[PDB]
Symmetry: D2
Subunit: 461 residues, 4 copies
C-alpha cells in the first residue's frame, strides 16, 4: 500500500476525482499543455517540491506536472485553503501530499517538512513551485545544501515575488526564479477576476449576509483590491476604497468609488484621535487587499460599527491586527473559520452581546478559507503559466551549469509575452471566443507579426 | 489690432471664456501646475508649435503654457474636433490659432502651415506639442532646418507615439520626444474613461438613438476599446468585442462580453464568403477603436444590418473603408457630421429608402466630431502630463547640445513614475479623495519611500 | 400656401423631415398602428387639440393621428422642450403648430390660445391630447362651452393624471379621460428608461462635466427617480437617494444606494439648523424627480457645495426654489438653458467668482430643455398608447351621449392590459426579440389564454 | 423530556442558535414586531400549522410567532431546503418541527402529517402558514373537519397564491387567506433581490464554476426572472431571456438583455425540428423562473451545449423535464444536490464521458437546495408581512363567524398598503436610511397624509 501522505480523510478521494474530472473540462489551457507535451515528457527527471493551496485546481496542476513526467511532494501554503476531497484524490493517485483544512501553525510547518524529507532524509528535489515564499525561505535558511541541486523556483503570488526580489537585491537568492504572478494571464486574470468571483462567495458562505445596500471599505486597489471592490459593488454594496498609491486611487475614483482614509487627512499618528470614527462607525464590511502589515489596526477595529465583518484576501494574517483581537477580546466560534469577536473584554462573553465583530478565516485568505478560492477556469491561466515556467527552468538545468554561467542566469524573470498570449488564446477558445487574424497589410501597418506578440513589453493592458 | 489667427467666428469668444472659467474649476492638476510654476516661468523663451483638437480643454492647456512663459502658435489635429467658442476665446486672448469645426483637408494643411510660418517665413519655434503626428511629419519632411532649433516633441496619442517609434527605429527622428500617452494618468485615464464618457455622448448627439437593448460590435479592446465597450454596455447595449490580441480578448471575456470576429473563424479569405453575414446582420452599431487600417472593411459594410450606425473613435479615418462608401454609395447629410449612406447605388437615393447605414463624423474621431470629446476633469490628467513634458524637454535644451551629447539623449521616453503619481494625487484631491500615508514601518515592509514612488516600472495597474 | 402656424425657422423643415423619416424606423408600435388603421380612418372627423413637447417623437405621433384621419392644432407643453426642426417639418406638412424652443411664459400661453382659436373664434375641437394638464385646465376655466363638444382627454404624464383625478374627485371634470401614463408600456418604459437615457445626456450637453467619481443626490425614487438614479450610477456617480415613501426607499437601498435626507432626521423645521450642511456640502449634482413642490429649497441651495449642478426632471419648475434664486442671486447665462447662479449677491458678480451653482433649463424638465428628451424607440410605447386612447375615446362619442349615459362614462381610466401587451409585443419585435408562445397545456396550467392577457390587473411588473 | 420532533441531528442546535442570534440582528422589521407586540400577546391562543423551508430565517419567524403567544407545529415545504442546524435549534427550544435536508417524497408527506396530527389525532390547529400550498391542499382534501376551526391561511409564494385563487374561483376554498406574496416588501424584495443574492450563490456552491464570460438563458422575467437575470449579469454572464409575456419581454430588452425563444419563431410544435439548436448549443447555464410546467423540455435538454448547468428557482420541480432525464439518461452524483446526467444512455456511463449536463437540487428550488436561500435581511420583509397577516386573520376569528358573516369575509386579500409601508420603513432604518418627512404644504399638494400611505393601490413601484 501507498502510505507516504497525510490527509484528513482518504475516503473523500472518489468525490475529489469526480470534481477533478469536472475541473479538467474548465481548464483548457492546462489540459492543452497535457495533450501537447505528454508524448515528449519534458519534466522526466523533475522532482518538484510544491507548496500551494491543496484545492481541486491545484490537483489538476499536480496531475499535469505528473503527466509530463515529474515526481512531486506537495503541501498547502495556508492552514485553511485545502479542499480535503482534492488532497484525498491526489493521495489516492499515489502522490505524496501533506495537507488538510484547519491545520495548526505547527502542523503547517510539519507538512512542509514532510515534502522536504523523504524517509527522514532530504529528498533529491531539483525544482520548487511556491505560493507566498514560505517553502523558498525554509530551503534557504534550513536546507541550503538542497538548493545546490535545484534548477529553479516558480512563484505564484505578488508577496512571494517581493520576497524573491528582496533575496536577489541582498545576494541571498541561491537559484533562479520565474515570477508567474506578473504574466498578464495571472496578475490581470487570477488576482483581479478570481477575487471578483471568490470574495462575495466566501462572505456569503461564512455569514449568509445580504451585501446589497450595505457599506464596505476595501483597503487597497491593486489587482486584488480592484477585483474585491467589483465583487462587492456588483452585489449592490456602497464601496469606499483606501489607498496609499495616488495612481490606484485615481483608478478607484474613475471606477465610481469614493476614496477615503481610516485616518483623518490620511495621517496615522498612532493615537485614537487620528481615527476617522465617523467613517468607520458606518462600515458593515472591511476587506484588506494590500499585502502590507497592520492596514486594519487595533484603533480601526475599536471604531468599527457593531457587527461589522472583517476579512483579509491578501497577506498572511497580519493585514488585520488579529493578535490584538486575540489578546484583548473574547472569541465565539460560530462555525469553522467564522468567529464573533466580542469587544466587551478579553475573557467571557454574553451569547446575546450586540457589541462584536465577525472575523472570517481568522484573518487568513478569506476566499480560500471560507469558500474554494478562485474557480477552475481562472486558475487555468495561472497554472498553465506555472507548468510553462517549470518546463523552462527545468530545461535550463541551472544546478548543472558552471559557476560563470550560473552568475549570468541568477535572476527573477517573467515568461515571454508570446507564451502569455498562447495561454490567453486557449482561455478565449474555452469561452467560444473567436480572435480575428490580422492580414499581412494590417500586421505591417501596426508593426507586429500576424502570430504576435501584439504589444511591446511596456504595454499595461 | 491682433489679426494673426483664423477662426469660424470671433464673436463666440465671450462664450468660450465662460466655458474656460468653468473648465479651470474641473482641472486641478493643470491649475496646480499654473500656481506652482507661475513665479519661476519655466517656459520663458519657449516657442511651442501646438497641433491638438482646439477644444475648451486644449484652451486651458494653452493658457497654462502661456502662464508659465511660453508663446504658442496653434492648430487642431482633426477637421471636426474644434469647438469654435474655444478657438475664438484663444484668438481673443491674442494667441495665434488657426482652427474651425468642419475644415476641408486643404484647410487642415493650411492651418498647420500658418503655425509653422509667421509672416511668410519659419517661426522661431523651439518646441512641439502634437496629437497624432501630422505636425511632426510635416516638420521632418518639409522643414528640417526648423527641427535643428527644436528641443523636443511631446506626443499625446497612441498612434502618434507609434509614428515616433517608427522614425526612431529608422534613424529619421531629429529631436527627442516624450510619450505622454503612456503615463498611467493618460493611457489608463483619458484613453479608457474619456471614451467611456464621450462615445455614448457622441452617438446620442448625432442620432438620438436608444442604445439599451440593441446589439453593438466594438472592434478592439485596448484602452479605447475597453472604455468604448463600457460606454455602450452601461447604457444597456448587448456588446460583442472583436480583437486580434488574445490577452485583450481574455479581458473582454472576463469583463462579460462575447468575443466574435466579423470573419468566419477570424480568417479574411479576400471574399464576401468569409464574412459572418449572420453576425453582422444583427449589429445595430459598430465602433472601431484599433488605430489599425480597414478593420471595418467594404464586405463588412455590405453585410451590416439595415440602418446600423458606423463610427470610429481611433485617431484616423481609415479604420472604416469610407473610400469604398464614397465611390459606391449615395451620401445624404442628415445634419453636420451625420450621413445616411444608401447601399442602393451611387447615383441618387429614395428619401424613404430603408437600406442605408448611418456614418458619424465621416469616419473621423466620433467623440470629438459629434460631441466635445473627453471632459475637462479627465483631460486634466493628459494635459498636466503635457505641461510637465514640455518643461522637462525645454529645460534639457537638446537643440543647444553638441552632436556627441545629442546622440545620448535622442530617445522617445515616458515621464518618471513620481510625476505620474503627483498628477494622480491632484486628480484624486479634485474628487475629494483622501490618500493614506504609509507609516515608516509599512514603507520599510513593502520597500518604498513614504513619498513614493509606490510601484516598480513593470507594474501594469 | 399655409400660414396657420408659428415656429422659430421654417427653413429647418427639410432637416426635421430627415429626422422624422429616421424616427419612423425607431417607432414600430406607432408605425404598426399607421399601417393597421390607415384603411379604416378611425379618426376621420376628429379635431384634436394637442399640447405636448414639440419634439421629433411628437412629430411622428401627430403624423400618425393625421394618417388615421384626424385634424390637429398643436402647441408644446414646455417653453424649452420644442425641437425647432420638428416644429418646422410639421408646419411644412400643413399642420397648425405654435411652438419654439425658448418661449417666454407669455408666448407659451399665446401658443396654447392659437390651438384653441382658429381665425379668432373657438375651433370646433372634439378631442384633447395633453401632457401635464395646462391645456386641460385652460379649457375648463376659460373655454367651458368648448368641452360640451369634446369626447375626451388623453393625458401623458403622472402630474397631469393627478390634476385630472383632483377634478374628478371635486366633480369639476367635464369630459372623460384616459390615463396614458399608467400603461406599463408608458410608466415602466418612458418614465424610467427614458430618464435613464436622457438625464445623463442633458447634463453632458449642458456642462460637459465628468460624472464618474462625483457625488449625486437624487430627490425621489418613483419611476423617474429610479431611471434618473440609474442614468447617474451607470456613469460611475456615487448616488444618494432621498424619499418620503419608505417602500420606494427600500427599493433604493436594495438597488445599492444610500438613502439620505437633506434634513437632520428627515425633519424640515423650515430653519437652516435642520439642513444637513455636511451632506449637502459634498454634493456635486442634485436632481429632483418628485412631481412635488420645494423639494430643493432655499436652505438646501445655500448649503450645496460650490459649483454643484442643480436640475429638475419632474414635470414643473417649482421642485427647485428658482424664485428664491431670482430674488437673491445673480444669474450668468453660460449658453441657452445653462446658468451660473452666483451666491455672492443679486446686482453683479465677479466673472472669476468660485461661489456659484449651475442651474440647467432654468429648473424646467432638464432632459427636454438641455437635450432632446426620450429617444424615439422609448416614446414609441407612450405614443402608441396615446393613439389607441384617442381612437377609443373618439369612438365612444361622449359629447353625443344623453346625460344619463354620460354620467356612467365620466371617469379617468387606463387602457386594457390586452392593448398594453400588443404595444409591448411590437416594441419587443423592434429589438429583434422573440416571445415564446404558450402550449395549450401550459396556458391551462397557469390559467391564461395563449393570446393573453398574461397577468391579472393587480400585477406590478 | 421533549420528544415531539424529528430532525437530522439535535447536536447541531448550539450552531443553529448562534446563527439565529446573528439573524435577529439582520431582521429589524421582525424584531420590531416582537418588541411592539410582546406585551399584548396578539397570538395568545393561536395554534399555527407552518409549512415553509426550515431555514435560519424561518427560525426567527417561528420564534417571533411564539414570542407573540402562538404555539406552532412546523415542517419544511421542500425536501432539500431545511438547514439542519436551524431545525435542531427550533427542536431544542421545545417547538415541534419535522424537517431535514434530503427528505424522500414519502418522508416529506410524513413530516406534514406530523404537524397535522398530535399523538395520532388532529391537532387543535386554528391557523395555517403555507409556502406553495401543499399543506393547504392536504387540509382541504384529507382534513376538512380541521378547516372548520381554522381562521385563515397566510400564503408566502406566487404559486401558492395561484392555487388559493383557483380554489376561490371554484368555491372550494374553506377559509380566508392573505396573499403575503403580493406585499411590495415581499414580491419586489424577496422574489427579486432574494434571487439576485441566492441564485449565483447556489450555482457557485454546487459547481464552483466561473460565471463571467459564459452564456446563460433565463426562462421567465417576472420578479424571480428579473432577480435571477441580475444575479447572473452582475457576475459577467452574457444573459438571454425567454418570456411569454410581451410586457415582461419589453422590460428585459430595456434592461439590456437579448430576448430569445428556445423554439423557432417562439412556436413549440412538440417536434425536435421546432428547437433552435444553434441557440441552445451555445448555452452554458439554463435557469427556470416561471412557476409553469415543462419550460425546459426534453428536446431543449437534448439540444443543450455539452456540460451545461440546468437549474430551477421556481417553486416546483416540473419546470424542467427531470422525469425524461430519469427515464432516459444515467445520473452520477457529484455530491449531494449535484448530478451529472450522461446523455449517452440509461444503463451505465464512462467516468470521463464529455456528453453530460449538470443538474442542481434534482430540479428543485436551487437557491435553497444548493445554498441557504435568501439572506436574513431580505426575508425580514417577507416574514414581517407573515406575522402581520397571522395577527390580522387570527383577530378576525373567521371560524367563529356565523355562516352569513363567513360568506362576506371568504376572500384572498393582500395586507393594506399602510402596513407594507411600516415594514419598509423598518427595513430602511436597518440600512441606516433616513426617509424625509413631507411638510404639511407638500402633503396637501400631492394629496397624501404626512404619515402615508403615499401611493394609490394601483401604483406598481
Ligand atoms: N487571495 C487570493 O486568492 C489572492 C490572489 C492574488 C494575490 N493575492 C495576494 O493579495 C495581495 C495583494 O496582491 P496584488 O496583486 O493586488 O498586489 P498589488 O501590488 O497589485 O496591490 C497592493 C495594493 O496595496 C496598496 N497598499 C499598500 N499598503 C496600503 C495601505 N496601508 N493602505 C492602503 N492601500 C495600501 C498598494 O498601494 C497597492 O496598490 C498579496 O499579498 C498577494 O500575494 C491573493
Ligand atoms: N478618440 C479619442 O479621444 C482617443 C483617445 C485616446 C486614443 N485614441 C486613439 O485610439 C486608438 C487606439 O488607442 P489605444 O490606446 O486603445 O491603443 P491600444 O494599443 O491600447 O489598443 C488598440 C487595440 O486594437 C487591437 N486591434 C488592432 N487591430 C485589430 C483588428 N484588426 N481587429 C481587432 N482588434 C484590433 C489591438 O490588439 C489593440 O489591443 C489610437 O488610434 C489612439 O491614438 C483616441
Ligand atoms: N421626461 C420627463 O422629464 C418625465 C417623464 C415622465 C414623468 N415626468 C414627471 O416626473 C415626475 C415624477 O413622475 P413619476 O412617474 O416618477 O412619479 P412617481 O409617483 O412614480 O414618483 C414620484 C416620487 O416622488 C417621491 N417624493 C414626493 N415628494 C418627495 C419629497 N419631498 N422628497 C423625496 N421624494 C419625494 C414620492 O414618494 C414618489 O415615490 C412627475 O412630475 C411626472 O409628470 C417627467
Ligand atoms: N426560489 C425562491 O426563493 C422563490 C422566491 C419567490 C418565488 N418563487 C417562485 O418562483 C416562481 C415565479 O415567481 P414570480 O414571483 O417571479 O412570478 P411572476 O408571475 O412574477 O413571473 C413568472 C413569469 O414567468 C413567465 N412565463 C410563464 N410561462 C413561461 C414560459 N413558458 N416561458 C417563459 N416565460 C414564461 C410569465 O410570463 C411571468 O412573467 C413561482 O413558482 C414562485 O412561487 C421562488
Ligand atoms: N476634449 C478633448 N480635448 C483635447 N484632446 C482631446 C479631447 N478628448 C480627447 N482628446 C485627445 O484626442 C487624442 C486622439 O487624437 C487622444 O489621445 C485624447 O488625448
Ligand atoms: Cl493583406
Ligand atoms: Cl512588439
Ligand atoms: Cl418666432
Ligand atoms: Cl437642410
Ligand atoms: K475553486
Ligand atoms: K469636452
Ligand atoms: K446689475
Ligand atoms: K429625442
Ligand atoms: K439564508
Amino acid at each position: 500500500g501507498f502510505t507516504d501522505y497525510k490527509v484528513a480523510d482518504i475516503t473523500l478521494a472518489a468525490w475529489g476525482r469526480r470534481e477533478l474530472i469536472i475541473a479538467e473540462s474548465e481548464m483548457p489551457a492546462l489540459m492543452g499543455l497535457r495533450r501537447k507535451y505528454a508524448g515528449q515528457q519534458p519534466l522526466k527527471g523533475a522532482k518538484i517540491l510544491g507548496c500551494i493551496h491543496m484545492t481541486i485546481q491545484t490537483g489538476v496542476l499536480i496531475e499535469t506536472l505528473v503527466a509530463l513526467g515529474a515526481e512531486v511532494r506537495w503541501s498547502s501554503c495556508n492552514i485553511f485553503s485545502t479542499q480535503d476531497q482534492a488532497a484525498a484524490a491526489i493521495a489516492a493517485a499515489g502522490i505524496p501530499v501533506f495537507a488538510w483544512k484547519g491545520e495548526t501553525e505547527e502542523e503547517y510547518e510539519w507538512c512542509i517538512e514532510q515534502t522536504i524529507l523523504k524517509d527522514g532524509q532530504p529528498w533529491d528535489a531539483n525544482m520548487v513551485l511556491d505560493d507566498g515564499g514560505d517553502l523558498t525561505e525554509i530551503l534557504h535558511k534550513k536546507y541550503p545544501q538542497m538548493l545546490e541541486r535545484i534548477h529553479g523556483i516558480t512563484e505564484e503570488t505578488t508577496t512571494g515575488v517581493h520576497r524573491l526580489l528582496d533575496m536577489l537585491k541582498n545576494g541571498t537568492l541561491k537559484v533562479p526564479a520565474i515570477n508567474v504572478n506578473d504574466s498578464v494571464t495571472k496578475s490581470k486574470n487570477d488576482n483581479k477576476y478570481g477575487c471578483r468571483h471568490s470574495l462575495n462567495d466566501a462572505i456569503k458562505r461564512g455569514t449568509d449576509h445580504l451585501l446589497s445596500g450595505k457599506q464596505a471599505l476595501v483597503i487597497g486597489y491593486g489587482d486584488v483590491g480592484k477585483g474585491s471592490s467589483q465583487s462587492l459593488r456588483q452585489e449592490g454594496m456602497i464601496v469606499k476604497v483606501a489607498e496609499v498609491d495616488p495612481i490606484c486611487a485615481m483608478q478607484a475614483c474613475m471606477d465610481g468609488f469614493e476614496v477615503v482614509s481610516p485616518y483623518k487627512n490620511g495621517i496615522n499618528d498612532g493615537t485614537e484621535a487620528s481615527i476617522d470614527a465617523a467613517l468607520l462607525g458606518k462600515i458593515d464590511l472591511i476587506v484588506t487587499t494590500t499585502g502590507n502589515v497592520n492596514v486594519c489596526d487595533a484603533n480601526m477595529l475599536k471604531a468599527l460599527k457593531k457587527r461589522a465583518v472583517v476579512c483579509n484576501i491578501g497577506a498572511f494574517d497580519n493585514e488585520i491586527d488579529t493578535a490584538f483581537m486575540r489578546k484583548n477580546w473574547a472569541w465565539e466560534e460560530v462555525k469553522p473559520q467564522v468567529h464573533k469577536i466580542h469587544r466587551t473584554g478579553k475573557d467571557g462573553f454574553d451569547a446575546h452581546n450586540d457589541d462584536y465583530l465577525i472575523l472570517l478565516a481568522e484573518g487568513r485568505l478569506v476566499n480560500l478559507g471560507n469558500a474554494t478560492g478562485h474557480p477552475s477556469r481562472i486558475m487555468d491561466g495561472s497554472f498553465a503559466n506555472q507548468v510553462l515556467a517549470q518546463i523552462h527552468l527545468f530545461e535550463q538545468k541551472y544546478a548543472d551549469l558552471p559557476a560563470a554561467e550560473k552568475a549570468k542566469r541568477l535572476s527573477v524573470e517573467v515568461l515571454p509575452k508570446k507564451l502569455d498570449e498562447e495561454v490567453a488564446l486557449e482561455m478565449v477558445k474555452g469561452f467560444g471566443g473567436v480572435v480575428t487574424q490580422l492580414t499581412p497589410k494590417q500586421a505591417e501597418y501596426i508593426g507586429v507579426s500576424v502570430e504576435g506578440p501584439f504589444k511591446p513589453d511596456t504595454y499595461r493592458y
